[PDB]
Amino acid sequence: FTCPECRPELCGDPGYCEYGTTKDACDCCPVCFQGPGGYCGGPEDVFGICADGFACVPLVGTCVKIP
Amino acid sequence: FTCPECRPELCGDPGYCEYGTTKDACDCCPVCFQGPGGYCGGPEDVFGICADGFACVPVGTCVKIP
């Protein structure tokens, strides 16, 4: 899948989020940061996007802090 | 592609969901429904998931079903 045109108005809302905020893979809309040890990866990072200092690790993977 | 099994306790918090709660793509993590007019679908509904009585309308937008 390649991303069709974005419109800032359309985006839903993730609510407040503890670890950070960031845009969607094509960079269109904001979503929340996955915490440490929480689901991530998947097609289009649907399962999460790791907060800064953390990297998605598979066995789809999970957020773990790098050195 | 397909889903691996998961740890329920793991899945991150989705927040208070004005339109309601549903399950994962892998049927594991809880998720909030997209409201009316909000972004809808894409690969695996990554973009959104329209609430019962609401349909993806082209990617697409949730539009109330009469």
Side-chain angles (χ1 to χ4, degrees):
Chain A
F1 155 81
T2 179
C3 297
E5 157 157 14
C6 180
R7 302 188 78 204
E9 307 189 6
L10 319 176
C11 315
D13 192 43
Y16 294 100
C17 298
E18 307 178 22
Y19 326 91
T21 279
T22 176
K23 327 301 166 52
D24 71 50
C26 286
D27 289 5
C28 159
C29 285
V31 277
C32 315
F33 259 153
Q34 193 61 87
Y39 296 85
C40 77
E44 273 266 15
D45 299 330
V46 64
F47 296 135
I49 284 176
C50 282
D52 311 336
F54 285 78
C56 210
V57 183
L59 170 62
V60 179
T62 295
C63 284
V64 185
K65 196 180 183 193
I66 30 82
Chain B
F1 163 93
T2 316
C3 286
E5 209 152 276
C6 61
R7 246 188 151 184
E9 61 199 5
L10 258 184
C11 300
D13 197 321
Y16 165 61
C17 324
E18 258 187 356
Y19 327 120
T21 285
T22 170
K23 289 176 184 175
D24 206 335
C26 290
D27 199 342
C28 180
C29 308
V31 279
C32 307
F33 278 135
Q34 180 65 110
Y39 269 133
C40 165
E44 301 307 310
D45 307 322
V46 50
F47 292 88
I49 295 194
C50 297
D52 297 334
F54 289 73
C56 212
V57 171
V59 197
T61 50
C62 303
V63 193
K64 177 49 184 158
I65 297 187

